[PDB]
Design an enzyme around this catalytic site. Structure first.
Site, mmCIF file in Angstrom:
data_model
loop_
_atom_site.group_PDB
_atom_site.id
_atom_site.type_symbol
_atom_site.label_atom_id
_atom_site.label_comp_id
_atom_site.label_asym_id
_atom_site.label_seq_id
_atom_site.Cartn_x
_atom_site.Cartn_y
_atom_site.Cartn_z
ATOM 1 N N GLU B 357 0.821 -1.205 0.000
ATOM 2 C CA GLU B 357 0.000 0.000 0.000
ATOM 3 C C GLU B 357 0.858 1.259 0.000
ATOM 4 O O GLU B 357 0.540 2.235 -0.689
ATOM 5 C CB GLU B 357 -0.943 -0.016 1.199
ATOM 6 C CG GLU B 357 -2.030 -1.077 1.116
ATOM 7 C CD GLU B 357 -2.820 -1.007 -0.178
ATOM 8 O OE1 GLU B 357 -3.176 0.113 -0.600
ATOM 9 O OE2 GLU B 357 -3.082 -2.071 -0.775
ATOM 10 N N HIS B 487 -14.860 -10.023 -11.657
ATOM 11 C CA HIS B 487 -14.455 -9.153 -12.756
ATOM 12 C C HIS B 487 -15.365 -9.299 -13.969
ATOM 13 O O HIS B 487 -15.656 -8.305 -14.645
ATOM 14 C CB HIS B 487 -13.005 -9.438 -13.138
ATOM 15 C CG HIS B 487 -12.033 -9.206 -12.023
ATOM 16 N ND1 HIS B 487 -11.993 -9.996 -10.894
ATOM 17 C CD2 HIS B 487 -11.072 -8.266 -11.860
ATOM 18 C CE1 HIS B 487 -11.045 -9.556 -10.086
ATOM 19 N NE2 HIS B 487 -10.470 -8.508 -10.648
ATOM 20 N N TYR B 497 -3.877 -8.516 -15.128
ATOM 21 C CA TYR B 497 -3.073 -9.308 -14.209
ATOM 22 C C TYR B 497 -1.905 -9.989 -14.912
ATOM 23 O O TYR B 497 -0.808 -10.048 -14.352
ATOM 24 C CB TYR B 497 -3.968 -10.315 -13.493
ATOM 25 C CG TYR B 497 -4.904 -9.637 -12.519
ATOM 26 C CD1 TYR B 497 -4.632 -8.357 -12.049
ATOM 27 C CD2 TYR B 497 -6.068 -10.256 -12.092
ATOM 28 C CE1 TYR B 497 -5.482 -7.723 -11.168
ATOM 29 C CE2 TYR B 497 -6.927 -9.626 -11.211
ATOM 30 C CZ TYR B 497 -6.628 -8.362 -10.752
ATOM 31 O OH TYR B 497 -7.480 -7.733 -9.874
HETATM 32 ZN ZN LIG Z 1 -2.462 -2.823 -4.256
#
Ligand SMILES: [Zn+2]
Ligand SMILES: *[C@@H]1O[C@H](CO)[C@@H](O)[C@H](O)[C@H]1NC(C)=O
Ligand SMILES: *[C@@H]1O[C@H](CO)[C@@H](O)[C@H](O)[C@H]1NC(C)=O
Ligand SMILES: *[C@@H]1O[C@H](CO)[C@@H](O)[C@H](O)[C@H]1NC(C)=O
Ligand SMILES: *[C@@H]1O[C@H](CO)[C@@H](O)[C@H](O)[C@H]1NC(C)=O
Ligand SMILES: *[C@@H]1O[C@H](CO)[C@@H](O)[C@H](O)[C@H]1NC(C)=O
Ligand SMILES: *[C@@H]1O[C@H](CO)[C@@H](O)[C@H](O)[C@H]1NC(C)=O
Ligand SMILES: [Cl-]
Lengths: 194, 597
Positions: B357, B487, B497
């Site tokens: 993050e 998705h 991805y």
């Molecule tokens: Zn992330």
């Protein structure tokens, strides 16, 4: 032993916006300058034409103090011979300027939740400004070809707002700025140091 | 006089207005997500409605500037990214039909419920019920029941809805001068008017196909090893040469094989790396975790966190009085404000997620100086890759020893690294064929190469050909089983991805070369190398104002996706795996199925 309204200029509540920079005229004083030091922790003290320790040993005829509020980057932007949207459309400082600039952080008085929309600035003017100019325009801009009337699709209102809120970054934070201009010209100096 | 300077003007107005409006909207979203109430919902709804109205207004106004008369590249990109009207090019009736269908998909997927055949009043959601069922239960029948019930309950509802979805999406794609909606999604990687850096819409297809061609051999080798382990576990359900059953892959759809580690571990007696005990023993808390990740980012030369970040971001679960959704998300509210929201727990998993993050946060802060329409990654696939590469770097035992969380006496050996790389393969190698499968299936569905009455037939045939997975229960065309994924049912591109998987290892190889590290890449660490940090920043500052190819070359010196970092990074596991696979069949036969006897 009459002093200037330095307290009355550094402790106001409604510093005007940059598109109308409030000018206070300073004369008939003795000039205490310890107050220029003790007042607030400060963020910028770039003096240009005068030594910032060797100022009490000088006499001036007239001194001008202009106060307004800008964002963080614009504080660095105010300098002799610069460029940008605050130095080319709102406030221009002369290249031969001799004085000191003042910049400290105002986060408690000039700040509020839910937004502050009372302050303004000007991103649009037909040309460049000349040093020390006041220009409260009301006209609508024009692109290059249209004889437009009013707020045309290519003709906008040239005033925006300084959205101020207390959860902003330091770089975008609302600094308080006042600029101090002296004149070293041969005339009877009415302000001197003790 | 000229039109490009008028566009400059209009953009100059738009950036300043949009900064404030978007800040209001995103702050409303934040105060909703940190405190779940109703009036917060009202506020965020009002703010988002205002923001969407502003967007549609700006697009409608700026559409009158024709792009054929702009020479400045940045202005052209700004006005193009602005001008994409998207759904508004279609008629209002079909537009509201589309949005109603989208909301219907969202409600069916999020509120889909399945009940056990013995108690009508006892029913389960997907999350957490079915997710836990097929992520923890080792019973073949329970996994099969969950799989079949979920699919038969959601896909049958979503089938005609998805049909009309595809129809309207193709219509709007052809309205916007695209041949198919798949081309609309492929338009993300497009660049033009930059010599030596261009890229066509079929070039992405060709590149991903060629890369999968090179990445396959590791994949069938891992498939053979996992098949051997599963047949050892389940002798009566798995053929030695057939495809693996769908409901034996560890998650709801076979997306990740991260679960199957406990059954397929090579050496189950070697200790695993877990400094959670080190967390509790030294009394580590969230503040210390994030200060750790702070100094980690400082060590490469990246700046500190801003004071507002530490002051106002919510670094812990806000007790029980107030509820919040803490999926790990990094928020870039603008105006120099950056925030993090996730429920920190004292585990090494959260320790890695914190680094991920804060990598997102550093990425966002790096291009803060760019204009409003270009404050985003060079493409979609850079944010999460940059986030994950920091976690990969921090997971190295070398760093753990350096920061005093792993005892210096810990003995690194071949067995432990083999286990580690097999875990990383089960996480990473398993998903690549599945993402390729789903994206290519969606692409040929949109393009029209598959008529309606064999979508699923072609889907499962191509799966048994490529990913080597065979269904345990036959299905007809009444199902919309692909829509049982988040998705697929909720309008997101999915090749992202695969692109991220290639990108993160390209970056890791480049930086590790820059760090002058020796030995296996999986033991490489980039800390205390300011050159690595400046190399990273040299692309970090770019945003998406220039072509993504130039940004990639700025880091690796190559102008395209390439597979060498992946294979080089997994090479020791590759030689181990081919060592084991000498006594097992390599490949899978498409004809065998669990339901054919
Ligand atoms: Zn992330
Ligand atoms: C401004 O004046 C008030 C009293 O009029 C005083 O309390 C305050 O401290 C002054 N501001 C500063 C910054 O000292
Ligand atoms: C500054 O503001 C005060 C109060 O608004 C006003 O009385 C004064 O004339 C202004 N000075 C200027 C505009 O130079
Ligand atoms: C969450 O919002 C409610 C509704 O106004 C409020 O009463 C409560 O104090 C809030 N909780 C916070 C801000 O932690
Ligand atoms: C585009 O415009 C920006 C600002 O107007 C300028 O900095 C840049 O050099 C220009 N580039 C070209 C290629 O015109
Ligand atoms: C900011 O970064 C500098 C450079 O490493 C560091 O010395 C300082 O401690 C950091 N700030 C804080 C509050 O830790
Ligand atoms: C990085 O340098 C610091 C400063 O000497 C040191 O304490 C730390 O152990 C080093 N880390 C690595 C991984 O070399
Ligand atoms: Cl599936």
């Amino acid at each position: 032993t009459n002093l200037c309204p330095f307290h009355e200029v550094f402790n106001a509540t409604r510093f005007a916006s940059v598109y109308a920079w409030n000018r206070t005229r300073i004369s008939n004083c003795v000039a205490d300058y310890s107050v220029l030091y003790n007042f607030a922790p400060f963020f910028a003290f770039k003096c240009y034409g005068v030594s910032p320790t060797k100022l009490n040993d000088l006499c001036f005829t007239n001194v001008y103090a202009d106060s307004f509020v800008i964002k963080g980057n614009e504080v660095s932007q105010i300098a002799p011979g610069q460029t940008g949207n605050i130095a080319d459309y709102n406030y221009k400082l002369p290249d031969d300027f001799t004085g000191c600039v003042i910049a400290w952080n105002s986060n408690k008085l000039d700040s509020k939740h839910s937004g502050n929309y009372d302050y303004w600035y000007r991103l649009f003017r037909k040309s460049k400004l000349k040093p020390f100019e006041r220009d409260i325009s009301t006209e609508i801009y024009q692109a290059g070809n249209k004889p437009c009337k009013g707020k045309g699709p290519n003709c906008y209102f040239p005033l925006q707002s300084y959205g101020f809120r207390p959860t902003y970054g330091v770089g975008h934070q609302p600094y308080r700025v006042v600029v101090l201009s002296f004149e070293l010209l041969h005339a009877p100096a009415t302000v001197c140091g003790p | 006089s000229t039109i490009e300077e008028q566009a400059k003007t209009f953009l100059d107005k738009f950036n300043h207005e949009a900064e404030d409006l978007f800040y209001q909207s995103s702050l409303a979203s934040w105060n909703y997500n940190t405190n779940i109430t109703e009036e917060n919902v009202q506020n965020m709804n009002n703010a988002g409605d205002k923001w969407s109205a502003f967007l549609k207004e700006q697009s409608t106004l700026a559409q009158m500037y024709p792009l054929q008369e702009i020479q400045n590249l940045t202005v052209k990109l700004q006005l193009q990214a602005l001008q994409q009207n998207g759904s508004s090019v279609l008629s209002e009736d079909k537009s509201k039909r589309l949005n109603t269908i989208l909301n219907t998909m969202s409600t069916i997927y999020s509120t889909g419920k399945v009940c056990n055949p013995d108690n009508p009043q006892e029913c389960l959601l997907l999350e957490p019920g079915l997710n836990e069922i097929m992520a923890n239960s080792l019973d073949y029948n329970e996994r099969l029941w969950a799989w079949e019930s979920w699919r038969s309950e959601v896909g049958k509802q979503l089938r005609p809805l998805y049909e009309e979805y595809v129809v309207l999406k193709n219509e709007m794609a052809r309205a916007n001068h695209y041949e198919d909606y798949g081309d609309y999604w492929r338009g993300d990687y497009e660049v033009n008017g930059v010599d030596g850096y261009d890229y066509s819409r079929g070039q992405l297809i060709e590149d991903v196909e060629h890369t999968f061609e090179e990445i396959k051999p590791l994949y069938e080798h891992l498939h053979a090893y996992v098949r051997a382990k599963l047949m050892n576990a389940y002798p009566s359900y798995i053929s030695p040469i057939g495809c693996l059953p769908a409901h034996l892959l560890g998650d709801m759809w076979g997306r990740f094989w991260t679960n199957l580690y406990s059954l397929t571990v090579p050496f189950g007696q070697k200790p695993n790396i877990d400094v959670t005990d080190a967390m509790v023993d030294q009394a580590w808390d969230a503040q210390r975790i994030f200060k750790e990740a702070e100094k980690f980012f400082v060590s490469v030369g990246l700046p500190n966190m801003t004071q507002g970040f530490w002051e106002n971001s919510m670094l812990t679960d806000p007790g029980n009085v107030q509820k919040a959704v803490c999926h790990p998300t990094a928020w870039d509210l603008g105006k120099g404000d950056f925030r993090i929201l996730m429920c920190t727990k004292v585990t090494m998993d959260d320790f890695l997620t914190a680094h991920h993050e804060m990598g997102h946060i550093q990425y966002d802060m790096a291009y803060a100086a760019q204009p409003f329409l270009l404050r985003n990654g060079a493409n979609e696939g850079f944010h999460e890759a940059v986030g994950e590469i920091m976690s990969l770097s921090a997971a190295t035992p070398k760093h753990l020893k350096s920061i005093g969380l792993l005892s210096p006496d810990f003995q690194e050996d071949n067995e432990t690294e083999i286990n580690f790389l097999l875990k990383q393969a089960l996480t990473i190698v398993g998903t690549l064929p599945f993402t390729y499968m789903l994206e290519k299936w969606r692409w040929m569905v949109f393009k029209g190469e598959i008529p309606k009455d064999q979508w699923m037939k072609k889907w499962w045939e191509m799966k048994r050909e490529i990913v080597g997975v065979v269904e345990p229960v036959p299905h007809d065309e009444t199902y919309c089983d692909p829509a049982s994924l988040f998705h697929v049912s909720n309008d997101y591109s999915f090749i992202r991805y695969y692109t991220r998987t290639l990108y993160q290892f390209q970056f890791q190889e480049a930086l590790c070369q820059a760090a002058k590290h020796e030995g296996p890449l999986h033991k490489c660490d980039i800390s205390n190398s300011t050159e690595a940090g400046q190399k990273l920043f040299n692309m970090l500052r770019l945003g998406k104002s220039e072509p993504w190819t130039l940004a990639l070359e700025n880091v690796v010196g190559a102008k395209n996706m390439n597979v060498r970092p992946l294979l080089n990074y997994f090479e020791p596991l590759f030689t181990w795996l081919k060592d084991q696979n000498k006594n097992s069949f390599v490949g899978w036969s498409t004809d065998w199925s669990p339901y054919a006897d």
